[PDB]
Structure formats: structure tokens, C-alpha cells
Enzyme design. Structure first.
Site, PDB file in Angstrom:
ATOM      1  CG  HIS A   1       6.305   0.638  11.224  1.00 53.70           C
ATOM      2  ND1 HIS A   1       5.827  -0.122  12.411  1.00 53.70           N
ATOM      3  CD2 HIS A   1       6.257   1.505  11.050  1.00 53.70           C
ATOM      4  CE1 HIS A   1       5.252   0.649  13.267  1.00 53.70           C
ATOM      5  NE2 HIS A   1       5.962   2.039  12.398  1.00 53.70           N
TER       6      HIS A   1
ATOM      7  CG  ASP B   1      -0.523   0.153   2.544  1.00 49.28           C
ATOM      8  OD1 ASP B   1       1.063  -0.670   2.560  1.00 49.28           O
ATOM      9  OD2 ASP B   1      -0.881   0.712   3.338  1.00 49.28           O
TER      10      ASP B   1
END
Ligand SMILES: [Ca+2]
Ligand SMILES: [Ca+2]
Lengths: 316, 316
Positions: free
Chosen positions: A243, A8
Site C-alpha cells: 500500500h 504511522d
């Protein structure tokens, strides 16, 4: 060994691309596009444009699903628009790639790639699991045929970031994430319990500016928007979390992380909907289908991260 | 080394007493009484009567608190009345001990015992934390002075048993459990993630009947009520869980369990109230205050359990 990212894209998501293309142990076959940080299509525009900018326009970007397993539509939440920006790349201006998305769906690209490369294939999704849920749905054989899945998402031993019990990528499609975890595929969850130990500040992005490249200036400008967003959304850290890159780092080198063998699920029904948690049913089953990351070698990861990405930024 | 149990006695709670009195490495100083499985007073009646029956009437039973940290009253839930019975001991008839509860409160007995025995003291609560919360409240010095706390309760990596996110002993008083975990005392949580791997069936209780003693027949009759309750409440196991004894087993021998160093909390405010979970705030703090059990040597524990308890049952 061969790599597919499911992204994404996404600020940390491009850092995952950068780590991947900076890592010679994997050939990045393609970037499957998904939604969350930004609209699904925007994810593809960025993926194409960025893969070009870093010097790798061979990376074929496929087109996954726009909305969740159990939803009709999807809008970008204003929180994620503040963090990753409107374009989803800070707000860094970058030329559109004249290459475009491949004809086939990303669902089918995954299934096809599994049958081609088998146990040499490594799928590393750092967006919602929506795509590989549909893949496992359509072709459940994947489970045993695929080499390994190594996602970024969830939080086992700690508070989530959307609410007290759910993490973003899982939050956007819990039902999909459940299907994946339960599938029995060789998954490795890299959740907040490990990613919130990772950190980088302007000390690190100033090094990318020193390289004086098109790519170096881009990644610096981009992650500095991401840090200035983190300065308001989480001033208790000082910089930003790494992340999505860490998922890729563990895909290449699983010794960066200490995992806990555990048969897992995602909560669908209760007021804990979207929580990543062990399935009690499969606690006494000695065969552990997936492994959740609990410890991490942060200084070695941070060195591996900068070495790979600064090396790639020098090339463009 | 010297032991205090804090018990809602309690079927598994007497198995903890039996393991303790069967274990020569600890001197059981006293049994602090609490509530949950049965009314607080009933906990004391059983403790006295059972300590007598096993051949150890020197065990002084103290009187803790009746209701939770943040409640006015307490009733036994009908679920726990089905499992542990009305008397809280199966429904096994056993003569009342003519000895009675000590004069001082269990709150003060703990505080006093900490100052007497210091780092030789081991406090092993397998009921609600209500008592030691009040102790740490009144005398916070305990934290550093006490040797170790080793509780049974909670569930970190798995579903709870009361609801999907909370376990019984924590459920009854979450706020107390939070105070304990946050205290910084050297706690070792032995939750469902480890205790649901433990098991015993009628194969094991028939061995206690073969000893032909007052104690052997009691423990067999008692745990057979507990198994027949488990036959309806959880037929997926076949026998019963060894929850509270395992806490004592790890108190004597910490190598029975594999722990995860982790700064912890208990959820108080949210719709996850009563959940045992890591505090994010203290994730990056390298000093880990307590340790949660995730793995366990089940066959060695089961052998240690039967050796100790069958040896004690032979003595009465
Ligand atoms: Ca992402
Ligand atoms: Ca109990």
C-alpha cells in the site's frame, strides 16, 4: 528533488522508507510521525530505529499530532495491532536509536520545508492526513508553493477496507483528508483501487533473507508477520498488499500509475462519512486539482520495489 | 443495427426518443415502458402519443413491470412530479395515440428481440433496470447473445442525485441494477459523472420554436417546464441536464464518451444501498464485463443532439 514521508510506522510504512532510501532520485529530508497503525510516539521510535538500521541516520524524525482533527484522544484498534503487531513492526526486536525526535513540530517542519525547497519538495503521507491539514490550516500558501503531494489512502471506484465506503488512513481522520483534497494542492491519491492490485508473498521475502544482512533479515521477519496476519484477515490474496510503498514509487515515477483527473472531497456529514468521492460542485470546473489512481503497472512496480529495497538491504 | 429503449417517459426520456428517431444508424424497434418519472402506464401513453407526433407511429410500445424487483407497489415521488410534471411530459397537452400497447410483455419482447437480432441488437434503458433484470432472470443466455446494453443511471466517481450515494434510475430498483451489472452482459453505464457535464438552456429550445412545427413547439414547451423545474432544484447549472439522450448518443457513437473498464456491482445491503461501485472481488480479474463513462465530448454531443432533433422536428 526532495522527499518528506508522513508515517504511522507501521509495516508497509517502513517498506515506504526502504523504497525511499533505495531510490536515488529523491533525498529523504525527514520522516514526519503520525498515528493509526501504532501510537504516534511508537511511530517515531520505529522511524528512528529503522532509518538507523538501513544505514541512513541523517533522516531527521519530526513529531506530528497524536489525535485526530476532531477527536480528543487516540487508541490503537486491536485489528491494526493484529496486522502490524504491538511494536508496529511485526514483533521484530530491533535496537532503539540513540538519536531522538527534533525539537520543532512536524507541522512547522512541513511549512518550513515548503518555503525552503518550494517546487522541488514532495510530501508523501501514508498515514492520516491530520498533519498536513494542520499545516494547510496554519499556512494555506503551501497549496501553490509545494511541488506535489502523493498520499496513500482512500478508495474511489471500490469498497474501502474499514467499512464498505472508507479506507483506514482516511477513516482515522476524515475531516483532515477533506481539508487536504479541497485545498487545491497538487495531490495524487493512491487508494485501494490501485494498491489492492499489488502483492508480495514469501517468494519475495526469502530473497531478502538470502542477502544475509542485518537489514535483510529485519525486513523479511517483519513482512512475514504482516503476511501471516493477512493469511487470516484476507486469505483471498495469499500474501500482503504493497500500500504505502506504491505512493512513494509514484512520487518518484508517476508513470507507474494511470490517474483520473478529478476534483475531489471526503464525506464528513452523511452515513457515508469517510468516503473519498468526487465533488459535484467542481465537476464542470475544467481545472482538476488532484488525480486519483485507477490503473497500475503491477509487475514493473514489483520489480522496481525489489530492485531498490534488495539493493538497500545489501548496503547494511 | 437495431435499438430498443426502456423508458419511464419522462421529459429527458422523450429527448432520447427524439435523438433515436433523428439518428439514421439505428432502427428503433420498440419502446419498452417502465416506471419512476411517472406511473408505468403513463409511460406507455406518452411513448405512443410522442412517437406518433414525431412522425413514427411504427414504433411498437411494449408493457414492462409496474413495481420494483423487491416491492409490492409504486407511487410517483412528488420530487419527480415537480420536475417532469403530472403527465410526465412537462404539462404539455398532446393528443392520445389511438394505437395501444402490444399484447406481449416487454420482458418477452426483449428476450425475443435478442434471439432475432442477436449482436445487431442494442438495448438502451434510461429508466429502472427492473425490466432487463427480469429478462436476464427468465433467460440468462441473453448475456452473450445481445450486442450491447447502454444504460443511463448511477454515479461512480461522484455524488448521486437522490441522496449523496445513489442516482434516481438505480434508486428505484437497486437489486435489479445489481443483477444487470453482475450478469456479465456488455453494459456501458452512462451516469451522473458524465451526464451532469451536459447542458441545454432556452437558447437551444428557442431554436426548436423557430421551426414552427407541431413537434418543434412540443419539445420546446416540454423542456422549458423541465428547465424551470431545474431553476429551483439546481440553479447551479442554469438550464437542464441531458441525461437519457446521451445514453442513446453513446449507443450510436461510443466515441462521444471516455469509459473506464471496470467490473461493477450495486450496493444492496448496507447504508450505501443503491450506490454504483466497483466489485473488489473482480478487480484483479483482467476481463472487464462493463465500462463506466467518466469523460465526454460535451460540445460535439450538444451539436449531434441539436442536429438530429431539429432535423426530426422539421419533418413533423
Ligand atoms: Ca500506513
Ligand atoms: Ca428517466
Amino acid at each position: 528533488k526532495k522527499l518528506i514521508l508522513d508515517l504511522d510506522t507501521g509495516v508497509d510504512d517502513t517498506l515506504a522508507i526502504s523504497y525511499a532510501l533505495g531510490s536515488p532520485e529523491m533525498e529523504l529530508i525527514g520522516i514526519t510521525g503520525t498515528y493509526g497503525n501504532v501510537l504516534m510516539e511508537q511511530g517515531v521510535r520505529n522511524a528512528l530505529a529503522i532509518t538507523d538500521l538501513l544505514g541512513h541516520p541523517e533522516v531527521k524524525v519530526y513529531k506530528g499530532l497524536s489525535h485526530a482533527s476532531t477527536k480528543d484522544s487516540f487508541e490503537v484498534l486491536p485489528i491494526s495491532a493484529f496486522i502490524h503487531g504491538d511494536n508496529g513492526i511485526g514483533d521484530v526486536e530491533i535496537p532503539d536509536s540513540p538519536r531522538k525526535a527534533e525539537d520543532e513540530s512536524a507541522v512547522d517542519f512541513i511549512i518550513d520545508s515548503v518555503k525552503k525547497y518550494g517546487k522541488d519538495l514532495v510530501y508523501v503521507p501514508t498515514g492520516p492526513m491530520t498533519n498536513i491539514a494542520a499545516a494547510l490550516k496554519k499556512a494555506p500558501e503551501i497549496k501553490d508553493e509545494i511541488g506535489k503531494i502523493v498520499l496513500m489512502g482512500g478508495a474511489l471506484t471500490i469498497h474501502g477496507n474499514v467499512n464498505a465506503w472508507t479506507e483506514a488512513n482516511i477513516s482515522q481522520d476524515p475531516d483532515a483528508a477533506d481539508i487536504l483534497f479541497r485545498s487545491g494542492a497538487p495531490v495524487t491519491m493512491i487508494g485501494l483501487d490501485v494498491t489492492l492490485q499489488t502483492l508480495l508473498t514469501y517468494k519475495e521475502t526469502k530473497q531478502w533473507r538470502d542477502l544475509n544482512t542485518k537489514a535483510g533479515k529485519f525486513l523479511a521477519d517483519m513482512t512475514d508477520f504482516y503476511i501471516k496476519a493477512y493469511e487470516t484477515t484476507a486469505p483471498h490474496l495469499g500474501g500482503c498488499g504493497l500500500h504505502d510503498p506504491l505512493a512513494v514509487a509514484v512520487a518518484v515515477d508517476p508513470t507507474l500509475v494511470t490517474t483520473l483527473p478529478i476534483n475531489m472531497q471526503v464525506d464528513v456529514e452523511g452515513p457515508t462519512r469517510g468516503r473519498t468521492i468526487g465533488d459535484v460542485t467542481r465537476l464542470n470546473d475544467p481545472v482538476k486539482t488532484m488525480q486519483v489512481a485507477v490503473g497500475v503497472d503491477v509487475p514493473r512496480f514489483l520489480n522496481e520495489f525489489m530492485t531498490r529495497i534488495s539493493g538497500l538491504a545489501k548496503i547494511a
